[PDB]
Design a binder for these strands. Structure first.
Ligand code: ZN
Ligand code: ZN
Lengths: 122, 123
DNA sequence: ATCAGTCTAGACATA
DNA sequence: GTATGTCTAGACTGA
């Protein structure tokens, strides 16, 4: 991405979904800042994709959903759309990697939203 | 006044407050249908100001506030703004009538929202 | 501090 | 039917 192009893109407006994504990430960071080293870890997974990373997790809701700026979704599905598959459609398209200790189906107190602890399939 | 004048007014758009009030009324009416005859009573009070009326009440929140369509206010003040003094500013301007058994300050289970169970005072 | 505002988990309701 | 949305009391975050 080009210097002149980058500048013009600075003024570009975002689709409602791009703006909603900003809130969803902004919400997640708020959660992670409280825990020690969660941010650095989440940053690790996204920056170095090949190298394995430990889970980054948020508390699970009773039905498992998360609400961000009036919209309800599943945590792994939401954050996987942001960083890996923008067209991801449902939790059925996702399955966990064995590395993950807190997958969505886990039904544990916590749910991992590390996008690289899940694998997209049909 | 003229019937045409009313019809032209029917097409009037309403400011955000006028629309918010409609939502606030819808919220209460949704609550009151659950209770027996409360609707019939609330109309009695609004229809006959002279004739005294029994309390009409809604559940009390912990901080006492009520939220409607993202806006928080006190229940007696909200509904008093709708039907008696639209310029009411805070609960300091309101005091309860002796008739009311569920006034705002009472810290009871239910809160009377009957506008004719309160009196306005300059403060 | 009372006061006011924002955010969302849970409850409820419709599709 | 479960999936998807609506609404707000409570939590929380600042004067
Ligand atoms: Zn994980
Ligand atoms: Zn009363």
């Amino acid at each position: 991405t080009s210097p002149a192009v980058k500048r013009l893109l600075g003024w570009k407006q975002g689709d409602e979904e791009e703006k909603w994504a900003e809130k969803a990430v902004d919400a997640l960071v708020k959660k992670l800042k409280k825990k020690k080293g969660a941010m650095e870890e989440l940053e690790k997974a996204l920056s170095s994709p090949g190298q394995p990373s430990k889970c980054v997790t948020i508390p699970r809701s009773l039905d498992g959903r998360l609400q961000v700026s009036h919209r309800k979704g599943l945590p792994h599905v939401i954050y996987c759309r942001v960083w890996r598959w923008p067209d991801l459609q449902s939790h059925h398209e996702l399955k966990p990697l064995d590395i993950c200790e807190f997958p969505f189906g886990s039904k544990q107190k916590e749910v991992c939203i590390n996008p690289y602890h899940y694998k997209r399939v049909e």
